[PDB]
Design a protein around this ligand. Structure first.
Ligand SMILES: [Ca+2]
Ligand SMILES: [Mg+2]
Length: 433
């Protein structure tokens, strides 16, 4: 009913359109060029690369890392689906981009750059990333500026990256794992909330707690190394009694619960995984729009539902409530692909969103001017931002498709992270069935 190969191709193109830094010779996004080549640490350390977080040009390390961990997990679990779609090598290239940035950002054992760009001055600008001239400060976490959440999430992404790459690029993968170990030790021994230490982040990606990141990073390092000390750390900071509200960049609870249940064969966490799934299934504790979207909140409902669908499809692969998980997950992804009458994936399907809240796609082809006129103009973004999952409709399925609707027309790295893995899982089920 939907071409998952095309969805996967375009989702990876969305991430490619988010790239910062010096772009490769085989860049597939024609309107994007080199940008932010001056991004650097306080001692001149190269910090070029990474992804712009959303429709802005800030490099927010916390969601960037979580998006990478979630994408890597889906590549591991649904490799068969990526392979069948012809998108496996492109998916690896996709997250190689951010993994390389995390390596650059880890300038020493106990210092990690967690943001480049002042979000206040960045968001006051509307124009191309290639045309930026404002100062782009860089801030780090360190013993004097702890960030156990940011550091452990990045350690999780690096450990997941080690697992993804170790059978094709061992030198790269081994470097990722070494930095994962070091960053996780840093997170454990220098405790605090990264968005208190990098205060510019608190208006955008404020972390509510870091203990779930500590359990998540431990669970990933246990998968990567099989060393008992990490499994111990996962039980130390993990919960067997609380059920996650959502799976997202702030809350890792059901992520590590499921990871420990499936990869590590632990049984203590399975009841909380099943609680989460049943809370999201029809008849649970998450309201559905009339036309069938599981709608947790006005803030990126597609993101929350796609994240839950991803969790459900990993669960199904390990035969946890498989039938209900697959039906629920498929219903949510298919809503986003166009079941309610329009696609919510830019550049895909029937009547996709035309005005994503996204600077570079809002600009006409070079050398035309791009400024706030292009924010306000009432027609479609000049460039098609293939693959971007928009925030989504209100609770009554309504969607105005206006660039100024910074809630419903938002796009972001984390919006696509669970979504893309869920699509690969659905492609994989087609091979099975
Ligand atoms: Ca957290
Ligand atoms: Mg164009």
């Amino acid at each position: 009913q939907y071409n998952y190969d095309e969805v996967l191709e375009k989702s990876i193109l969305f991430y490619e359109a988010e790239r910062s830094g010096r772009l490769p010779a085989n860049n597939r996004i024609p309107y994007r060029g080199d940008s932010a080549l001056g991004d650097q640490g306080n001692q001149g350390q190269d910090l070029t690369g990474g992804w712009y977080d959303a429709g802005d040009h800030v490099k927010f390390g916390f969601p960037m890392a979580f998006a990478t961990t979630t994408l890597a997990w889906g590549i591991l679990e649904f490799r068969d689906g990526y392979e069948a779609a012809g998108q496996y090598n492109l998916a690896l290239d996709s997250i190689r981009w951010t993994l390389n940035y995390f390596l650059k950002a880890h300038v020493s054992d106990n210092e990690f750059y967690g943001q480049v760009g002042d979000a206040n001055t960045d968001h006051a600008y509307w124009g191309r990333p290639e045309d930026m001239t404002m100062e782009r400060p860089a801030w780090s976490i360190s013993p004097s500026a702890p960030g156990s959440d940011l550091a452990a999430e990045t350690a999780a992404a690096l450990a997941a990256g080690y697992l993804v790459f170790r059978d094709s690029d061992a030198a790269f993968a081994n470097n990722l794992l070494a930095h994962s170990r070091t960053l996780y030790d840093f997170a454990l021994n220098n405790r605090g909330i990264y968005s208190q230490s990098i205060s510019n982040a608190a208006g955008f990606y404020a972390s509510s707690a870091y203990e779930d990141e500590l359990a998540w990073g431990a669970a990933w390092l246990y998968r990567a190394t099989e060393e008992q000390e990490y499994l111990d750390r996962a039980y130390e900071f993990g919960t067997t009694t609380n059920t996650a509200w959502a799976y997202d960049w702030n809350e890792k609870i059901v992520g590590y619960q499921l990871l420990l249940t499936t990869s590590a064969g632990q049984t203590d966490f399975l009841p909380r995984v099943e609680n989460f799934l049943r809370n999201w299934f029809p008849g649970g504790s998450v309201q559905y729009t009339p036309l069938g979207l599981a709608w947790l909140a006005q803030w990126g409902p597609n993101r929350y539902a796609a994240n839950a669908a991803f969790i459900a499809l990993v669960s199904a692969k390990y035969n946890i409530l498989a039938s209900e998980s697959e039906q629920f997950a498929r219903s949510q992804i298919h809503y986003m692909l166009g079941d309610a009458g329009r696609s919510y994936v830019v550049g895909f399907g029937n009547n996709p969103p035309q005005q994503p809240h996204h600077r570079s796609s809002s600009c006409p082809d070079q050398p035309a001017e791009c400024d706030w006129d292009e924010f306000n103009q009432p027609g479609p973004n000049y460039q098609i931002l293939y693959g971007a999952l928009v925030g989504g409709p209100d609770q009554n399925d309504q969607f105005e498709d206006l660039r100024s609707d910074y809630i419903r027309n938002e796009v972001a790295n984390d919006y696509n992270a669970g979504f893309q893995g869920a699509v690969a899982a659905l492609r994989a089920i087609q091979l099975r069935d």
